[model samples]
Target: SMSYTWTGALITPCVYATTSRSASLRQKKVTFDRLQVLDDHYRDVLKEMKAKASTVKAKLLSVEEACKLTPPHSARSKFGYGAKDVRNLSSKAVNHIRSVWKDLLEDTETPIDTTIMAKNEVFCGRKPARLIVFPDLGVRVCEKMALYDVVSTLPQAVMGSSYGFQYSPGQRVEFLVNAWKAKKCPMGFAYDTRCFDSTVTENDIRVEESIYQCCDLAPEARQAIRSLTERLYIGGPLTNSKGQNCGYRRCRASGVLTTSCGNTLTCYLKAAAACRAAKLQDCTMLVCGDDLVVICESAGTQEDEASLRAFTEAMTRYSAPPGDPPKPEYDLELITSCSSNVSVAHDASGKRVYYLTRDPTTPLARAAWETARHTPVNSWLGNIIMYAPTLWARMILMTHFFSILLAQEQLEKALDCQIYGACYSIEPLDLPQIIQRLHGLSAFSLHSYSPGEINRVASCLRKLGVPPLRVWRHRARSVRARLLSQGGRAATCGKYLFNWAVRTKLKLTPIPAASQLDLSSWFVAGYSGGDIYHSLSRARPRWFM
Candidate 1:
């Protein structure tokens, strides 16, 4: 049986093929301390970052104010306040957050260990368990409205353009395109931090704390920060699904850091230092959690290979060594980050589209979960935005998800989800703007599909138990007709986006004035360089968390 998501809640019939791995190298446990050898320049960068971190003056938001920042469609508490209650400002949910906040402020000595669950995410065509390291819902809510502000803003101030999550796919693709064009072929490769979460040592956690202390926070916020850091941030234990004792974790917990800002801070610290040590010329980097991509001026193949080896050595000395069991890849043609590769391919338009794409298993698995019940993340919407012009995403993923959503009468409902762990609130109505934003206006006109793309789509559908594109075409025709009969945004969405799915393409029509609804707040405020922060909190209603 195939699994849906990490929880294995919904089981499908077929198993997708996992990609082959290179032969495993010698396996050994690496001591984190073996990697640390910081010199003056590295020290200077750290000092500069620390100084900037100290200058950030963020006030601690009150419990009520912070609670209001919670997206109505956010993931619900497994303990108290289900999604609907949380979204509607129910007294139970608000009071739960307040009590959790109060407890964090009062209970400083006790360690607030989080529950660790294995997230079923696909990486490189293989199903691997990514840690869903998160605290209780109440504490998460507190983290969001209060400490989240600092974590969200401080990294950008310190790292500047090196912050990876700041750039969208188009932005990143543009940067790479320009960089590659400059050098014809730039010396670029991605660095993987093996077990990045498990490898974070107590020293690294403490360094993150030191950075936090530099910030001028309110008294309550400071106490909360210490409590969060000591109890949850420093380390926690892992509990299996069967409720058996797994083990105590002394490294940075994946739930805390990846969910919050811990990994970003830690990765920046280590990579920034390593960049200095490797002595690459004009090194520009894109760092996201444990995944890193560096593009610099190529110094011939022989010299470039030597530079990469030196870079690897410097990183190993810094306590964040290459991945265990084997090692990271240093390649020129393909560089993988966030489990997706940046490569060249021609879209249906016959123009070269530089894209970040992987297999469709993860998207299909989440869709299976949606078919069985409901889903936490709107995986389809995120996929469309991130890979709007990709054949698999735009055709298969959109067809399946929109078909399901319309069947459930969820077209009007906005769902909150994250892409690569960053929070985003997405709805069906916002697809046009998002697609245009990520892929440009050409997305509306991309019609042709290659046989290889279509074949892969067919193979993926069979493996995931999803109906074929032929069936999707039939469903789309009905959906398109229904939306057109309704005659509004539904009709516009059907005409522009869904029309491609049908056998006979409808003439592209101008989107109605009412159809162009202002959905700016549909995206989560703050944390991603947007000007408006909290003005759109109450925009949703009766939606599940």
Candidate 2:
């Protein structure tokens, strides 16, 4: 898996090669009977999911309450109030949100046209468009507070162990490993939904609505839910950056359904139904929005190919077709999701670290944004937590972010951010526990840098306007000295992160002291179009952008 180095170019030789390869992969289609009959079990599974959807009793939050849920540093308000005022609970923000809420309730039939933002997603070596469906500052706040909790909790309940976002990188790796070890012939393939957001039909929205109505909601909550659905949730108009009408959007808007809860439910339902239709034995699915990965006991290569084709057919019939069409790419060892591949690397201790990683592009881009300005979410920190064992994350991401935070004297500040779109309040002190939980004892151990990875990281740094590794290495020494002087957990962090570079490596100690701190309050919660609420927090939000 060689990755291309991206400059601000329309195309390069490297880019051309990468693009050509991907196009070939996309064109490689799975051949199967398009009219293949689905089994009773598949029908039963679909019925079961629909029934569960019927029992949903999701309640909507008040404008003020929803505004409170918006993190201080979220993508700034296009209308007014900006990030700082929004995070500080300004009266202006509340007033604006109130007006928006009122408008939403009154104009339920008005189709909200979402503004689309072009997010440079370099991880896949392409710039995929990210929909900024709600541009109104007030409306975005309400949406976050209203549905954040639902997205966090409801999927696990409805989809059970199949919910992908619930698992950390470590857990996902462990599951993949165990599945491969247990099955004599384990087959796994990642599913790519074609125009997932654009394909969400009216029927799909109604199914989501049915799920929401299942909950025993307060009358006001029910009305709010209906209004939100009618005005924004169902297909809305799509507007581009230049205020051009891109057309009326009738599918799930990427920004709304994703980062919230609708997309996950829709994807899981379709995938589960397809799995049943394919009749794969012991089929297990992991779905996070449009990203899907399936693992099951294989029935030989020929049969597996047919099964996959059948799965594709069933999914298309169920309203989710493969965008590029699926190829029978089965593997017992590696699978990719979220633009990340499951791989093995070694620590300085020579122990193998199993982790998920993608190209450094996305992390580097976020890092550059963080370096120049404030961000609602610290993408580097979250990446470190999830991919701490990787050479690039541990060495580059850790060194770079710590230096930046130290320079700003903001290491101790508890900041609200997201990982995989689920909100969490992060503090520098929490890194040890997060790393330990996700990467085990290796979090404190030394890691040997991969030459290729290091080179790519260096290239990424230059491309994204980050200082070179030597500068980060220099900063680590200063940061280590400062942390050691602070003692307590700060000293522990220095010991774990900087030990490899020092003359006398600090002894790895148990972080029970840091672990004792109650981190329950660190995670803020809300609900989706489902009844389940999470650890709701009343804390004021903060901002970077």
Candidate 3:
């Protein structure tokens, strides 16, 4: 699990995320005694979730509809079809996908096939292959047809504000702020599962399949769901890319249409149930793809610690054991979840504006900014889009990438990246529009940040051997001026993004075109490994009217 490259000074190992050696080959105990019975509170939550989904009707996707949504860079199929062919609606891709779906409708007795291979992430440590378990493109297309609408609609109705996918980044920050404020004395903690997907038992998989089954569906769609469930979800045979038999899967597949939604939904259920069992008062849960954060009224420090202790014990009995072991965090800013924290910075008006940012840690971040070589579809650009309001993202990420793009004369070119598990081809100019849509105008005017956040950023800079914030401010002024010299969207980026660097304090208002962006569908769901695409269309959202 800890191999190193022998290139010495020039190219040593990055030593990133760990490999899955132990879990991969272990015949560990997968079942637990039914020690804790679901009380009425837990049962009530499930019934309510089922009741809300009762009105839901899953309208199946046309072959063409699914085609248009296919990501261009998605993995090719074992069959003679690729994402490009599907997107163009070629005869072979269309006819073959249709053929698979029809055969799938017959509800074959044999289990379906999935390839287990290492993840193809960029600049990865030689960590173990992530073992992405996904079906072929044809079955993938059929997956969209059966549950696309269900995946799109069900979570919001069932989970309410707790469904993390419904809120854009700024909205998410807003929700957290409001929820924390609503509590009289807020006590919070971010839960971490030991191995989220691996913890998922076969029974849990079947349990979620019924939620989709309860929703009314098209005839073909209904059949497809049953077939998909029996073949893939319940249990399936795994194979390597060499077509050699690897094993069978009884846990959740990390790569599937329902992966994000399934994990998110169950996490909400388990934690919510655990919250009630511990007798916590007025709890608010926000779940983002199994990375959960809960805030609720504190019963004094002693009682709050006592409550969390019982909560973890309750969770343990349910097979939802802790990784870091849950502890109550006092301040909203102190709690960390999903590698993010809600921290404050002042806008020009001197009011505290909160944005979610990460703790800038050691050399990993240092290497990313200092090194000239960039990875394709990098998290660097992705985080900038998702966490646009952060001091680190605005000052460091934007300053670094836009400066690089300016040098390469690729400012107008689309840089491939992934945001929240979905792949995207984003141009630097489009960022002005995308940022405004995702983060709003506050991202531009943030200044006089919190001391804790500023301290973190300052320390990270010194360790990276990069210049200080004041130096970056001077550098940004020059970048802003150069971008302004170019005019057009780049000028707008310079003015809006780097206004913090200048003494002029230019007025920052909303972008006109940002109003025209259609983000309703881009975040329709998490689309973890669904391989979805969204064209940067100017279409209006229906809810506005």
Candidate 4:
């Protein structure tokens, strides 16, 4: 659940997104046109595939009719279907049947083997399903494919190796099929999901002969397997505006499934939960974004129809297919170049150059400009404040102690026991006398403490010597000021520089600091004045199409 570099097999996709730096750019936008364009192209491919398939289907149907016209008496009596009539069909009919039922056709010649699929089998034909193989931890497959098969690849190993990883579920499925591609082996071929499913042990394992021995999987990997099982039961959501829960990679949420830095985790969690409830088993789930994709192959045994129904039910929660969704235009900033002109060496011209400056407005030029303006010295103060929480707390206590000692005469006990706890006691509280008895109400005064120990010792002084409300508020502010360095001036400077860099790199207008805080104003003083906001040509800028 906590993904990091060391964790293997958890593959997520990576994306580069720019935080808005433009002033008056009220809302930044991105659209699903990229995905829509993809879907359109896929739709065309599907149409072509359907056209081809239709031709084949028509041809097969004609032959089936000829075979079925003369149904055997056994078919009418025993069951609804006729095995005798099927066998009696011509070679063309047999070929048609084989083609139609390619995936289910068994290879009688090769004995079932555990290692690989048989070469001669039609299902394992030349075109092995081109399954997109995602290495578990982003590790180079060439390096470690030697140690274990695809089934054993862990999530963390393929960490950042998703450069060429395709997120399409269809493509991933094809990649998997091809990974098992082999010419010929005595090992049984053809897509027998049960072989992979048998590796998992959600249900009780049945130990039979030597070939059927039950295998135990790693407990850690079990979670991934179960997750995959559930995902398959609930079809992964298709990424879009209304149907944001479609798939892990396509979730519209920022960052989780999306490459544009939107979250996709909520959809993933939703899909995973629905999938699990349906007892979805024997499928793989691939998670990729920010890192490589994680493939969880399931091992549970469940009825396919039931599991499929569950998947449909889960997918229903994410469905919204009809009508055109709002398409927003996204601003894209590409980083063109980076400075490698170290020491500013001159070429054949022989002119010595000190600092080489790139062209303005371009991403690289902007990056260089901002880098030149960055001030690291001002940024380090924030880190110090973060480490000094107790220092701040103690300062508050010291201020409270001093305030109470200064004005003990004005203090009064309340009548309500609920409000003041012990105020209703028979003994009248001599507030001023009590304050004087405590000696500044401090167990350890500034005189008794070492310079290094003042903040630490002041904490004990807080409990008994409570300050007036006004003094307490001021003391808290004082502590905050001390910790963050005068309203975190240095940190503000760092953020301003960061914003400047973003503006330059992204062609964004500079956002000035609002009146509430002076941090942005002071930070922007380094740059020459200009109209830092880029206003829209139209009220909405035609952002949505």
For candidate 3, write residues 157-209 as lDDT tens digits: 77889999888888888999999999888889888976666667656676677
Best model per TM-score = 3
lDDT of 1 by residue, 81-118 (tens): 75457556689888887877888888876766455554
Query: lDDT of all predictions, in order shown?
Result: 0.61, 0.61, 0.76, 0.22
lDDT of 4 by residue, 193-236 (tens): 11111111212111000101112333322332233223311112
Q: How close is candidate 3 to the true structure, as a TM-score?
A: 0.90
What does the lDDT read for residue 24 in candidate 1? 14
Candidate ranking under TM-score, highest first, comes to 3, 1, 2, 4
In model 3, the worst 10-residue window by lDDT is 1-10
Which candidate comes out best when scored by lDDT? 3
Question: TM-score for all predictions?
Answer: 0.77, 0.75, 0.90, 0.15
> How many residue pairs clash (N, CA or C atoms closer than 3 angstroms) in each of the candidate models, in the order given?
8, 19, 1, 52
Task: Tell me the lDDT of candidate 1.
Answer: 0.61
